[PDB]
């Protein structure tokens, strides 16, 4: 079945940059659009960025824009997130998520992402000086 | 930036009772919405998508309703298996989530 | 006069996976599903038109440098060999086909300009009446690696089963794209190229201009538009020596509520997506 | 008789800010200018897009004075 | 050639860095298969230095005007007539109000125109 | 039957009782195609009420011992001999230290309107 | 005596997509790729053995109720018609094939027991020597919906190009699963079924026990094990009337550093994944 | 000569807590008992797994006193 698994997240000082990765399996990874979503410790959920299919289209939330860059390698069925220039305001559990809609060459990527079909057990990122 | 609003900030009901959860939308989202439950220390899971459709493998006691601004989630025959914060999403414009409603058991 | 009259989805698949080859588009055509009662190149080139060269071997000369350096009166003529290090300049016997440019629209609406440009910005031809150019000359829909852009009237658009008549949403319709023919055809949303607009001299720099439309020139080659299961109508075996496996049209194996190209619970037959036939490949 | 083909009818919902949308319509005897055609002719000949539109740039066209 | 090997060659293998000159292909030990006015090698479909899934690998062991343009400026490339194909500009060489352009070798096939299991590396 | 329609039937259209009884298939107007001791209908591959990519749709318009088990308890289904296939139990019916069992299909071994007419 | 000796990956594709059918497994076979110098039913059932019934029509009686209700001295016998509402109890002419149970292992390591059970917890046979049971009788690898689990010694495990000899990580090998044969074959990690262990009476409840292995019984039908491009060795056209399109074996459309089933920059040929023979479907 | 088939050598790295791992090894003349064999014979006939192992439960087996 579908299985989303997030790799290393740790402690980074403000202004530092770390990289996250998600190993997806149990489904054809290239066909769907993957998204990162964020939940601050007491706060609710916040969408961060999305990459679709091949990776031609990439969009970010206005909070993360210019700091964060998302990318995927279809060859290795991995989704990446590169966090740069972090703040203390950017610390929360991070979730790897999946778009339900299916993409093939005979068609175009839908303009927007839909509901989040599957979720990984999120990795946590603390940004503090300690 | 459609702002979503979860009507009860928290809720407490006994098992076997129905629980009516609802959220509102700052602008029309027409049958584009979703419901998630997040148990403590787990990832969210899709309950309902669009206005009302149940995700695969979801119990039949969960039901969605509503269109446009205001929507409703109802849990028939609530059990103890269900203690979670419930969120609502919009997939119109850029995705935004509601603040959540914690269903507490008596 | 549509293919799904004569071909089942499995019969269509049997055709497009194994074979290199084989009137106003109005309604009222025979239904695609036999229980209802009612009232050509098929391959994608594996090479581009610009890459046909041998990558290991040099060729012919081209003009590399018009100035020795920066300064006054630096004019010079320097020449180089065309080869693998610079492939853009090499001599070629054949060139891509004709183009008539389409405006480019994005499936992401916020990428689009906030104005009503549907009829205003579309390409057209006059006959004293304006006729939209649809679908127009055959051109690739989008550049390789691009999935959100599509030509304004460049490609065919089919509606999904149940779609209304007027002002339907983007999700309801199915838009076909012809990326496959991009190797020998120009992209529908791009200029065909650039030309020189003047005679240079010491006092005037070389000036260029874009080519929005380019007719037939001797040496052009092009692919025609693809046919679809749903499209209008009016065997060649696959001989290839290719070592690695082809792209085939298949149906995804993943649990879903319905079976694609089958009836649903209410008895309505539907065709989920547009199936054209370009899957196998040929050398250019 | 209608065509089974669609064209892009409306790119905005109305006057205002951030109104972008995509709406499609069947081409039929109601609107004959937009129908898909198999053959084209060989006053200006027509118009072509000169640029990529975006939120910043409006769609621009230009006159085709000669065609082959 | 190539020590009796088929070796993937790519844009980046040679240092690359330019999109117009990006290529992907294979070099072969040799000296239905893929006239260019020049060892046997060939190019197939590419995206940058990466290869798209439609690319092919062949084992050979298995057998009208377009106006053309001295000022003291560099205009070799910037002042050149070119045609663009899939986001790659290509010089027009040789090639065929003011009408700058007016329309009407193998032809491309188109519609119109101790035992060990390792292989032996020692020769 | 079915007002001349092919209609999808499944475990859900019957209410979706339980895992062992879940199914997916089609009911046909009729009365290479898919002996069960019984309108023509058929079943195909399913996962729960859903179907998978191998599920096929056919348009008919297109033409030893195994021990078997009164106590005051309900032992009908619990105390019955069964065999499991893909995680679904089926009664062994009829069918063929103490040895409770002993061993010895095509398989390897053994005005104009475009809408369809609903008026009849 | 391996299929890739005689078949290219492309030729293998032609075989499995279009056709229903066509010594210790040691090293030293002719190299898969010709430039190296060195020192059967191909289909999946569209029905499952338990579902062969007509879904719309009743059958024969079964024992529905052995007690009227809660209480004492409630013994009674009730019967019901075998029909669509309850499909588990219907009479069936044929039963699934034999089984010899394998231990189950998860590819997620944290949910595997923290002990060394490779050799101890493995199914084996004795001939005064103990030989492991590998791969064993033909059995499904896992239940529908669990892809992570695999039989300890149940399947054929191939190594990736360059994989070492000893104690390689799970990503250096390729594990094949017989998902297709589940329709007629019991899961390798599940019991065959249950049998009665006693005679019930007023003084004893009906007692049952699990069958952990089963030999041939009259009326069993089963599928053999699939063969692979890599696997050991020692035409039939498709007649199907299926309306919707088949599942096919296809190469991926995404851009990648290397083309699948080809050489890299160093000249090393590799096989990225195992290819089974079962894609087209038949009725049961 | 080695086989090209791999078998599961190790389910734990070493002694300790939380040592779960999966390692594989070529079946070869070194260890013959674990080679994949095409045919089987017709004392106990062997052992079979009687349970699903998990983090909670150890792998259990039982003896086969009769087989067909």
Automatic annotation (TrEMBL), chains C, G:
Family: Belongs to the parvoviridae capsid protein family.
Positions of Ca(2+) 1 binding: 177, 180
Residues reported to bind Ca(2+) 2: 180
Gene source species: Adeno-associated virus 9
Coverage span on the entire protein: 287 to 736 of 736
Protein location: Virion
Domain of life of the source: Viruses
Name of protein: Capsid protein VP1
Binding sites annotated in the UniProt record for beta-D-galactose: 86, 119
């Amino acid at each position: 079945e579908v299985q989303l698994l997030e790799s290393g997240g740790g402690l980074v000082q403000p202004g530092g940059s770390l990289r996250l990765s998600c190993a997806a399996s149990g489904f054809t990874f290239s066909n769907y659009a993957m998204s990162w979503v964020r939940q601050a410790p007491g706060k609710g959920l916040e969408w961060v960025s999305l990459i679709s299919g091949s990776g031609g289209s990439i969009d970010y939330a206005d909070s993360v824009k210019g700091r964060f860059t998302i990318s995927r390698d279809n060859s290795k069925n991995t989704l990446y997130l590169q966090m740069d220039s972090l703040r203390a305001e950017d610390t929360a559990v991070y979730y790897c998520s999946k778009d339900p809609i299916y993409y093939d060459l005979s068609g175009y990527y839908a303009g927007r992402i839909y509901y989040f079909d599957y979720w990984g057990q999120g990795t946590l990122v603390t940004v503090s000086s300690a | 930036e459609i702002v979503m609003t979860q009507s009860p900030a928290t809720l407490s009901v006994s098992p076997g009772d129905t629980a009516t959860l609802s959220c509102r939308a700052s602008h029309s989202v027409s049958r584009d919405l979703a419901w998630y439950q997040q148990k403590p220390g787990q990832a969210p899971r899709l309950l309902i998508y669009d206005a009302s459709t149940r995700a695969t493998g979801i119990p039949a006691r969960f039901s969605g309703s509503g269109s446009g601004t205001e929507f409703t989630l109802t849990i028939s025959s609530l059990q103890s298996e269900d203690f979670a914060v419930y969120y609502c999403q919009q997939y119109i414009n850029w995705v935004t989530f509601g603040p959540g409603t914690k269903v507490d058991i008596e | 006069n549509r293919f799904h009259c004569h071909f089942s989805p499995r019969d269509w698949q049997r055709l497009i996976n194994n074979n290199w080859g084989f009137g106003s588009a109005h309604e009222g055509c025979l239904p695609p599903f036999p229980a209802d009662v009612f009232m050509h190149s098929s391959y994608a080139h594996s090479q581009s038109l610009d890459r046909l060269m041998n990558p290991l071997i040099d060729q012919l000369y081209y003009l590399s440098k018009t100035i020795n350096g920066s300064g006054q009166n630096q004019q010079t003529l320097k020449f180089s060999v065309a080869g693998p290090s610079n492939m853009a300049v090499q001599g070629r016997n054949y060139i891509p086909g004709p183009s008539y440019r389409q405006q480019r629209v994005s499936t992401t609406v916020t990428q689009n300009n906030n104005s009503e440009f549907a009829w205003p910005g579309a390409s057209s031809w006059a006959l004293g009446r304006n006729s939209l150019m649809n679908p127009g000359p055959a051109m690739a829909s989008h550049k390789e690696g691009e999935d959100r852009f599509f030509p304004l009237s460049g490609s065919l658009i089919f509606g999904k089963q149940g779609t209304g008549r007027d002002n339907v949403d983007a999700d309801k319709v199915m838009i076909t794209n012809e990326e496959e023919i991009k190797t020998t055809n120009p992209v529908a949303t791009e200029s065909y190229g650039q030309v020189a607009t003047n005679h240079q001299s010491a006092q005037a720099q070389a000036q260029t201009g874009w080519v929005q439309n380019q007719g037939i020139l001797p040496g052009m080659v092009w692919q025609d538009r693809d046919v679809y299961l749903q499209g209008p109508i009016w065997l060649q075996k696959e001989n290839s020596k290719r070592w690695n496996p082809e792209i085939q049209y298949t149906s995804n194996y993943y649990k879903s509520n319905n079976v694609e190209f089958a009836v649903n619970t209410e008895g309505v037959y539907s065709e989920p997506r547009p199936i054209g036939t370009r899957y196998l490949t040929r050398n250019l």
